[PDB]
Structures are given as C-alpha cells and as structure tokens.
Amino acid sequence: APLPQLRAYTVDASWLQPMAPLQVADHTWQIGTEDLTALLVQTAEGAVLLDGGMPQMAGHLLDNMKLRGVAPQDLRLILLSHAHADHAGPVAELKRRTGAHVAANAETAVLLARGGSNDLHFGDGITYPPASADRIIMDGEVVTVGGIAFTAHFMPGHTPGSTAWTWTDTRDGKPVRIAYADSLSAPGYQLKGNPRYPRLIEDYKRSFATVRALPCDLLLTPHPGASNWNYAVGSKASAEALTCNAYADAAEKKFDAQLARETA
Amino acid sequence: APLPQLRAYTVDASWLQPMAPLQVADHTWQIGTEDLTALLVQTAEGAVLLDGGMPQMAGHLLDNMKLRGVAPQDLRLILLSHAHADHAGPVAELKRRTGAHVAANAETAVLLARGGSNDLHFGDGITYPPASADRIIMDGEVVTVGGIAFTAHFMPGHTPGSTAWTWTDTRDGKPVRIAYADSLSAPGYQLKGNPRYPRLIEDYKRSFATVRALPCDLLLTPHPGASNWNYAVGSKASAEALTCNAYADAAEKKFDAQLARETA
Amino acid sequence: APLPQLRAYTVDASWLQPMAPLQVADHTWQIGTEDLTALLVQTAEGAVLLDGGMPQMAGHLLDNMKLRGVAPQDLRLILLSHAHADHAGPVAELKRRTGAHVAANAETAVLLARGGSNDLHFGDGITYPPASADRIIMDGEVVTVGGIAFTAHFMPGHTPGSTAWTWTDTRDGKPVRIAYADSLSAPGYQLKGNPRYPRLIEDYKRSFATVRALPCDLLLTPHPGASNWNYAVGSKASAEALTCNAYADAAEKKFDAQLARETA
Amino acid sequence: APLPQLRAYTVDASWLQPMAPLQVADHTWQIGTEDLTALLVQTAEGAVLLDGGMPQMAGHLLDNMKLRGVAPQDLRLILLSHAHADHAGPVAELKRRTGAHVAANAETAVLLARGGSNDLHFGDGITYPPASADRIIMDGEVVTVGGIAFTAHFMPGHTPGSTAWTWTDTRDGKPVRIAYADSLSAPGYQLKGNPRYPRLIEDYKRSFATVRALPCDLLLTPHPGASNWNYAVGSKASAEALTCNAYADAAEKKFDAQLARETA
Ligand SMILES: CO[C@@]1(NC(=O)[C@@H](C)C(=O)O)C(=O)N2C(C(=O)O)=C(C)CO[C@@H]21
Ligand SMILES: CO[C@@]1(NC(=O)[C@@H](C)C(=O)O)C(=O)N2C(C(=O)O)=C(C)CO[C@@H]21
Ligand SMILES: CO[C@@]1(NC(=O)[C@@H](C)C(=O)O)C(=O)N2C(C(=O)O)=C(C)CO[C@@H]21
Ligand SMILES: CO[C@@]1(NC(=O)[C@@H](C)C(=O)O)C(=O)N2C(C(=O)O)=C(C)CO[C@@H]21
Ligand SMILES: [Zn+2]
C-alpha cells in the first residue's frame, strides 16, 4: 500500500468565473471573478491592487488592468486581506510581471513568505507560490498612493495577519467611505484550546468590535457573498449589501454557535 | 564637504564585561556579561538559550556553555526577548556554530530577518548580522524542550515583537516560577502620533497589564538593572530584585512622565 | 468558460512505495521508497540525511530513522542533490520536527526558498512547501559531520544548483568511495537558446566531465534506475549498478540525441 | 578586560565626495561620488540604476536622479556588480523610497539577503542593511528595460556573484558598446587552499578570460581608478581609460604576483 498522491486545491467553478471590470466608485473597480474580489484603484500616480484571488488568475487580472488603461508597469502597490491561496494566489507572478511592491503586516508577510504552507489550521493542504513583502505595515498605519490614503485595521482571527483596509473615494464628486474587510469565518477551525493559536477566541471577539467601528459607507469582502454583494448583476451588485454592524453581528452569532457545538 | 562616515554601535564597557556562569535556579544560568542577560537552561534533551546580547559575545557565550558541560551541538533552541543588537546580536553566528533553531513571533522574525535595520525608531543606526527564525510562535504558545515548558507572553511596546517568557524551574526540589520579561522602556521614542507605530501607547498600556499578571516568583530582564539585579555580587544578585507589579508600576510612571513631557 | 482548476503533482505509485532501510555500507542506508533515494548516514555525533523525496514522505523517513536508533533530535544535517519536489519535498517538515540544518549552494537555496516555484522549465507546475538553507556551500567545500567528510561537486544542468556529493565509508573495515550524483536528465527542456538558461548546454557538457572524474567506487542517484540500482531486490541492489563513466556516457548520448532532435 | 567595541566600516573621504551627474553616453550617467561608480540609464519606460555605493548615499543618489528629471517612482530596476557595502549599500533604502526591483544572480542574492554579513573573506566586518532580490538572473541572460538590453556576464572571484553588465547606447546617434565590469581584485584574500572558497583560483582565471572577450568600446568599473577613469575632470573623464584586455591583463599580473607571494 503506497503512500497517497498529493491533492490539488480545487474550488467551486464559480470562484474561477472571469468577469469584466465592475465599477464600485469613481476610482475603485472589481476585476476579479464572480465570487472572488480583486479591487483595483486608479490614481494619478499609479494603481493599487487589493487581493488577487486564486493563483491562476494573474493572466485575467492583467487583462482587466489593460482594459482600464493600466499598463503592467503602472501597478505600484499590492495590498492583501490575508495570505491565503484564494486571495493571495497570484501575488508572486504579479510581482514578476508588473514591478509592483507588496505591503503587509508581519503575520501576513511570514505566511506569504512560506507560500501559505504550514497553516495554523490547514497545514500544507493549501499551498501557493511564495512571495516576499517589501514593506511592513503596523495597525492603523496610513499608506498613501497618488493622493488616496489607505488605512489598515488589524482584525486577526481567520488568519493572524487578517487586515481590513479603509479609504475614501468619490461617487461623481460625492465622497464615499469604502471598507474592504477580511473574512470573519472559521471553517473547520478548532477554536477552544488550540495549541497553534492559544488566544484565538480573544482575537476573534476583538475583531468583531474592530469591524463594527470601521468608518464605512460601502462594505466589500474577499468573498462577496459574505457581505451580500452580487457581482453578476452588475449595476445592482451593491443592492442588498450589508452594513459593518450587520456583517459583524452575523459573523459573531455564527462564531458563538460554532463555539457552542465545539463544547459538545 | 563629503558625506559623513558610518558610526559604530558603541555601548558602555560594563555591557561587554564577561562574567562566569551565575546560577539562578537548578537549571537556569546567567552566562552573559555584567549588564547583559543571556540565560541558559540545561535539560535532559538539550539546552535552551534566551538572548545573546551584543553580536561580539558569541565566543564568550560558547565558553560558558562549555564550562557547564554543554557542547555546541547541545544547544537546541534560541529564544529572544526582542530582536535588537544588544540582545539578539550573536544569533546569526550562534546558529552557524551550534546547529540550534530559533523560535520567535512574526514581528520579531521580520525584525531579525533584516538584521535590526529599518528600525521603527532607530532606523539603520543599530544594525547587526541578520538571522532567520525557524519556528513562528503565537501569544501564549507553549514551547517544550526536555520537559521544561516555556510559555510566551506578548508584551509589545519597546519593539512590536517584545515577548516575555515564563517557565517553572526548581530550587533544590522546591519549584520556582521564573519570568524573563522584556524591557518596558521607550528611549527617545516619539510616543504620541507616530506614523510608523500608530497604536504604540495602546500597546504599551496593555503590556503593563500583561507583566503585572505574569506568573512570577523571580523576575529577570535583558538589562538586569531594570529589575534591580546585580550580576556582580554573585550570591546576592537576586537580593534587591523587584516583583512584577513593582517593575510594571515603575515603568508605567516613567512612561506617563515621558508622555507628559512630549505634550509640551 | 471558467478558468481551469489547479493540477496536483502526481507521480508513479512506485515512487511512493515505502521500503525498509537497506544497507549500502557500514554507515550509509537507503530509507526512501522503491524508486526514490533518501540516504541516511549514521555517525558518532549525529546523522546526515541526503534528500527526502516527495513531500508526503516525512512520516516514512522518520519511521526508518527510528528503526536505526536515530531520534528526531539526532538528525543534524540535510544535504540535497537538487531542490525539486520529488527530492527536496519534505525538507520543510523535516526541519520543524527534527531540529536539523540544511546545507546547499546559492542556486539550490534560492530554489528551495521559493518552494520550487518559478522553475526555469516547469514554472509553477511542481510546487512544494518552501524551506530555508542555514548554510551556503561552495564548489569543492568539505562538510564534516561526526568524522565523515562530505565533499560537494557542482554539476549544474538538471537544475542550476545540482550538486554531487562524495564521501568515504567502510565495508566491514574496507574503505569504499561513495558518490551520490544528481540526475543528468533534461525532461522536456528546451536546450538550445533558452532565455531563462542561456548557458545550459555548456553547463551540461561540463557536468558530464565532472561526474566522469568523481572519486567513486559505488554510485547512487536520486532515481535509482538512472544508475541501475534495484532497491527491491535488497541484497542484489548494487548488482548491475553502473560506474561513473558509464552513467555519464549514457546520459551524454541521450543529451546529444535530444539536442539533435531539437534542431529539427 | 572587557570585550572590544564594534568597529564601523570607514572609507577614504574621496569615496564619499558627492559629484554632479556626469554624462557617459546619450543615456548613461554617473551619479555616484568621485571614487564610487553609480550608473543611471534613462529609457522611455523608466530608469535603471547600476550600483549605489556606500549605504549613506541614498539621499545623494535621489538628488541626482531628481536633477535628471527622474522621479523616485521612475526607477524601475536596480542592477549590481557585487553585493558589497561600498557598492550595494543603499539598495535597501532605495527599494523602500523608489518602488524599484532588484535583479541579481543567486550568489549575489544570498549575499545581499544577509546584508554582506558572513563574508567569505571579511566575515562580519563589513555589514550593510539587507535587501531582497526580486528577480534571479542567469549567466548570459538578457534584461530589457525600455528598449535597452542589459546582458549579464558572470565573472566570479572578488565575490562568487560578481557580474559584469554590457549594453549598447548611443553617442549622438553613433552606437557605443559599454561594459560595466566588476572589480578583479583580491584584497587580503587567501587565494590558495581556501576552505570557504575551494575553487577560487579557477574562478579568477576564468573571469580574466571572460572580461577579455567582453563586447566593449568604453569600460567602467565600480572603482573608477581600476579602469583609469577620472570622474573629477568631467569632460576628460574617459581620456586615459583602459581597454578590456588591458584591465584584465593588469589585474591578472597582480593576481599572479599576489599568488606567488602567498606561496612564500
Ligand atoms: C483556505 O480557503 C478557505 N477554505 C477552503 O477553501 C476550504 C479548505 C475550507 O472551506 O475549509 C478559507 O479559509 N476560506 C473562506 C473565508 O471565508 O476566507 C471560506 C468561507 C472557505 O473558503 C476559503
Ligand atoms: C537599541 O538598544 C537600546 N538603545 C540604545 O542602546 C541607544 C540607541 C539609546 O539609548 O537610545 C535599547 O532600546 N535599549 C534599552 C532597553 O531597555 O531595551 C535601553 C534602556 C537603552 O539601551 C538599549
Ligand atoms: C520535476 O520532477 C521530474 N519531472 C517530472 O516528474 C515531470 C514533470 C517530467 O517528467 O517532466 C524531474 O526533473 N525528474 C527527473 C530527474 O531525472 O530528475 C526525471 C527523470 C523525471 O521525473 C522527475
Ligand atoms: C569590501 O570593500 C573593499 N574592501 C575594503 O574596503 C577593505 C576591507 C580592504 O581593502 O580590505 C573591497 O573588496 N573593495 C575593493 C574592490 O576592488 O572591490 C577594493 C580595491 C578595496 O576596497 C573595497
Ligand atoms: Zn482563507
């Protein structure tokens, strides 16, 4: 009986369904797939990319950037929600082909540096090509690119380095506060008494209070279904989207119900 | 007028004064200098080293390890308080000559990986040879070597990755709770409104409460004067040493007096 | 038409067939699989491991090390032929669970650091968890562990960092020169005019002359079929094994026949 | 008798004497100091920087780049001759402030990654802030930026990763072949029987033949005195500059005279 073969990280086909650039505000665009969020922000001095999705999406992300008049050498900065394969997948290839830099916290950097291997909960089951972080950011640090200021808010839980980003864009002159908040889920996580994450419950609770107080008028998430976005319907994509308090309150009730069944 | 020459990190001569191994408990020893703490813990499966001091102390640390019957290949683990040159200096050379591994958190790892360069407060003024961290530890994670369990307690402030360590040793059969707590000082730090550390005051305050609640019967610090240790007097080294509440309360009063003068 | 799913690196089942430790000489053992070579060398000061095979073989390698009386904390050094997933797979997990160090050249280190991703010929198709190299070795450098000296011989071609290792063991007192030489194959490689490897043909030719002059009495390869070893037959495993000149001459004829068909 | 203090890497004041941009050809400029070469190449798609000199020269290099109409976000690529502190010093700070990427071979990358520490000949005596290499280049690989193609030629010896660069510029329409070749010196090196560099003499000899065959009409070196450049005299800077054969022949005679005195 020989050892088993390696298994590939397979996702639902909807996660890999390419879509044309969808406009969120005057400067923010969705260039990912139907169920994976990859936000592009066009500024006067370059473009910022938030997440990239699965690792095989680098060619698609470059296509949509070309459609917005953004050359590869115009991507200046890559920001991440958390360093998982379905969000930070193409960061390695995107760095080689665009000349951009990556800014993330220490926890996201060390997870990104080892390609998501040795995950606290998944181990080596979900591995993507590694990439280095050129700039280390702290909680509440302001990253400015082309006049648009990005503020990081640490919300650990899903991963230790889970970071929420906030920035102010315009909607035909009217300012709008956007908040790209990370996932607040714990799929298959051992919450209570985890030797690899001893203070996980504390971090999750404190993160719920963090996203409740986020300066937010329009909320987006790495998985658009978590914030009730519908990238397929285009114009009405932000129709039934949730607030920050609602998304936090909904996630916390699921965390307590999950924690309760774990003590059984 | 040519550009200035580089300046070397010079310390007081007392920091570099070698001393013979001083016994703290049945398994814990001080093998550093008179004013720099480097703790060695002998176990049945190997030895653990906490800090190393200045980078030019690797030869001295190996001498004292040889005196305790510890071969270079017997050092199994290196733990750090924070990745500064006067504490984590010889970690690079100690790894090459002992075959040991380093365990630190993400913030200490990224600071250790770039050799203390690009410090949040000191910049490139205090640079030491870089070294990689083989194991990443979380807050409250238990690291066991030879039956002795080391528990990490995150106390950020002096550095983002400042970690306090606790373990239980014996004093001729009687158990003793030891707590090696990091420095709680902010020398020349801009505390209020620091763009490189926006939540520094919050982290400092929460760290004072962390060291107050540390399970501690005997307290040691990277600088022994901070906890009123006197490594010169040998037997009476722990005579006038401070408690955890006293060391925290003394450091917090200095933090508030420093914060008050900063708003002036 | 959504983007395709990721494909897993699948190998022949014979590559993953566990086998009991096979004795090569007084100190050298085969602890890998039937068709993947993982050499263990027991010394008075510890054990050296050459290669590990596929990444899912860490548990098997530890089992055979336990059978030879080698505890996890007794593995002191890991040496590699080249940093590919079917040879350097478990190096990341083996470092975390044994406390060993890795010694490889610069080319093998940078390939090992990015987990085999961005291969010069395979791209991201063959990815394994990354690992760092603690010691950098040069061509002809001697690495000594427990009295047994390992000499590295650079033989680039299959990978830029392909390294052959030589050491002298005994066969019941009689000395024997062992040479673990890397693969001299180019499967699917574009040999002529490769923009990612412009001097590949020169490196391959110079490597044939390198393995011809290797001090060798018994030859082993990462794939035992390349040197006509038969790990299944146990005692007669080295029966029809090839010399160094024969293995080089056989590989060079295949390289020229491959280069000839490429110019057609 | 306490341990000695750390010593700072001090150089001659002429090495740190800032100078205004000196024109080499239609696109190549000297923006370093009087005795340290830092070449800037302006293209239609950005600027390439070859070397940076001492680490405290980042502010000066940015000043001269601003004088040539080159914004910080216009530096796209950094190329190195070898990763020593007097050539690769400011690469870390230049990456943080310009958003550029670094391209170097594996040997230069691993030396650049550890900040020049653990030098094969100097140890930890000459340490600069570390920096990562975003792209790994092979011998003879072509790097194109804005139509100008840079070809790397490995010439190991001074350092294992010593790389010479060649590119074709114009002199008011007339093409000119420029060759920026590394230093061919061995200051204080143990040449014969070096355990850290066993094949050093072979690499030095093969490097002399490499620079002799370099496609070169105008030669420059990291130290301009090595190729008889005089950056002070401005217009007549290339007056008495040497050819490639002359610079190689002069360096080889010094290598043999140095090797002869070593065997005495
Ligand atoms: C690592 O990627 C994830 N996990 C998986 O794909 C498998 C392994 C799983 O469900 O256990 C993960 O975390 N995600 C999230 C999230 O909310 O971030 C959700 C909801 C589930 O999908 C991705
Ligand atoms: C980086 O090393 C330190 N700083 C210096 O040496 C100079 C630069 C300084 O005083 O500003 C630093 O922090 N230390 C501590 C500590 O408590 O940790 C104290 C009390 C002061 O000494 C060391
Ligand atoms: C990356 O691993 C290899 N390649 C593959 O598995 C597939 C991708 C392939 O054949 O192209 C590779 O190289 N090997 C060797 C070797 O001789 O080293 C041989 C003979 C073939 O198997 C492994
Ligand atoms: C590490 O920097 C160098 N060495 C020194 O500065 C001291 C340490 C020394 O001379 O031994 C080094 O190599 N250089 C070269 C070169 O040709 O590259 C020459 C000629 C000498 O200066 C620099
Ligand atoms: Zn996830």
Ligand SMILES: [Zn+2]
């Ligand atoms: Zn996810």
Ligand SMILES: [Zn+2]
């Ligand atoms: Zn300090």
Ligand SMILES: [Zn+2]
């Ligand atoms: Zn200190």
Ligand SMILES: [Zn+2]
């Ligand atoms: Zn291979």
Ligand SMILES: [Zn+2]
């Ligand atoms: Zn193979």
Ligand SMILES: [Zn+2]
């Ligand atoms: Zn040099």
Ligand SMILES: [Zn+2]
């Ligand atoms: Zn030099």
